[PDB]
Amino acid sequence: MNEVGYDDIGGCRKQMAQIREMVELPLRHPQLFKAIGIKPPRGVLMYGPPGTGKTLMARAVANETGAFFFLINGPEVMSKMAGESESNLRKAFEEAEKNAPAIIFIDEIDSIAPKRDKTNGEVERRVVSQLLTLMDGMKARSNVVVIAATNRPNSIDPALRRFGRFDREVDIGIPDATGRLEVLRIHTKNMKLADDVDLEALAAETHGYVGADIASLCSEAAMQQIREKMDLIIDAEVLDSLGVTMDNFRFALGNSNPSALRETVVESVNVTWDDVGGLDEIKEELKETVEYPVLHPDQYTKFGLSPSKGVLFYGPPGTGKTLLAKAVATEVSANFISVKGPELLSMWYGESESNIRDIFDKARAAAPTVVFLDELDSIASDRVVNQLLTEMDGMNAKKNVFVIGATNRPDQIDPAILRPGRLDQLIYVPLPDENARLSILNAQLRKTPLEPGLELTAIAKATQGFSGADLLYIVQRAAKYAIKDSIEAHRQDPVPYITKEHFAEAMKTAKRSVSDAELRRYEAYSQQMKA
């Protein structure tokens, strides 16, 4: 069992098709490339978080295309004297050249060709130079395609990304819910799965689960089932009766440690406009700013305009700014990236694995995309401020890259941000509305049963000028009271719904998050700026 086709992968239709074309056209039909009269592309750099299926995908494409497949590791060939490694590399390239068509899979290229700033040993520079010379020396007629894999795309010598080298980059992010379901189906094609299963529920619950983690979860569930069935002990009645159960999957979920979320990565979004509580004027203003240009580029080009790539939000905390940003990213079918506090503060201190350049380059590669920076004032240090300023000034013409920032203290942040060519667009978050609060409560209570047609108007009219977080805190307090009452009744679900007493108790205990003086100051500042 060492052969796998495209059917053995899931959740990467876009990347799978990209690799398929970019590595089959130069091999299967090189004639058309010369018919147009161009040099077919050679380098292909696929990168992603560890355990996302890079090696498996490369092996699958190589085996399915039926092409000569010379495989080179990373540290294996790197740990040796300069003569030996060069010998190894030259032999690999010569063998690939001699027996065309050939594909070379230089795995873990990062170790071979790291960045010169921190690792400047002459061995690394010599190896990189020979690799570049060999890469440029490949004959156009020869059908050789080089594929490299790495986990930190910005942690390699930039020279390898120039034309005539690993130019075409591919990013393999976390699989989505559909991707997770596909992976689960692929892995669970041999287990004696029981009739009762919730694969869709498992996909919904599993967030930030790379393929490796999903396989580990399936194996753990099978082991748990075996352990449960080991008590009865071989009888064929035991063998046939063996079968995994949804409870096993839940236990495995409870006993696993996903690691994709550790570092900043690209994630999809699905939020929608209706998820917000209203404020249609701000929605339309933001649409004019960000989305309409993408849908009306011809009008802007005719009259003459460029998209204003950047908007800064300010106002009371916990007002749904993140929900608005996710909705905006969803409406353009673009991947979303976020950085929150420590994610950038660690780079500010330097102890981290990803730099601001890394995230910006990932956003560019996965364009179109929206990058959101929370508590942007948390850094207002000088180095990170300068780097952000330079990156923002380095905005592309029509790449649709957008940056959004969250901060309730615009004055403290460096005024350098609010200048032409930067986040000159300022948006204030107003107070929530009664209808907005009622809609938020209903949305948060989609699954929790309550009184049919429960009277929330009294609470809505009692909660005037309260922040969004107050509604959620009140809901949680009422839910805790209801659970306590149900537990007391059972020990001493006859009342699945909840009456007004829980909400009244929460209101008595509940207090506003935004202070009256602070709210007044924010409103006065907003009005002064508007004037």
Partner: peptide
């Protein structure tokens, strides 16, 4: 069939 291959179903995968 598939896998550049050409009881039969198992052989052709």
């Amino acid at each position: 069939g598939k896998k550049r291959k050409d009881v039969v179903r198992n052989n052709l995968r």
